[PDB]
Amino acid sequence: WWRIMLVDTQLPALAASISALSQEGFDIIQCGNAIEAVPVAVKTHPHLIITEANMPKISGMDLFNSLKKNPQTASIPVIALSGRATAKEEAQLLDMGFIDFIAKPVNAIRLSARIKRVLKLLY
């Protein structure tokens, strides 16, 4: 029973990947922006969080920092998904504490394995 929260401003584009994960046994909690993501994370306690890195208004880094402010969510691992994925962006997010970084477009096989590796390591 693995709860996985996914935060992205264009969830429809990930519909394909998300469907494949459900089949994998992941319980996907979908959020369209950082505003709803924080309160939802605090009450649903996902085992892992996947967030788009560059979101308007509130970014993935902003979400990461907000999650660190609540003891309930401060230790939940966070994976960044980015449509830019410059070497500098990847390094900055990893240096910040993101548990992993995945460049879009998202590949369900790659995403699934990345999620599992982190879950195996932390749980």
Q: Please state at what angle helix 60-67 crosses helix 87-96, rounded to 10 degrees.
A: 10
What sign does the CA torsion over 7, 118, 97, 84 have? negative
Q: Which residue is associated with the tokens 């240096």?
A: 95
* Residue 40 neighbours by CB distance under 10 Å: 16
Positive/negative CA dihedral, 14, 16, 22, 25 = negative
Structural domains present in the chain: 1-123 (3.40.50.2300)
- What span, in angstroms and rounded, lies between the C-alpha atoms of 31 and 26? 15
Residue 64 contacts residue 98 (beta carbons within 8 Å): yes
List the beta bridge partners of residue 80: 51, 101
Contact partners, residue 118, CB within 8 Å, separation at least 6: 48, 77, 79, 99, 100
What does 55-111 look like in DSSP terms, one character per residue?
A: -SSS-HHHHHHHHTTSTTTTTS-EEEEESS--HHHHHHHHHHT-SEEEESSP-HHHH
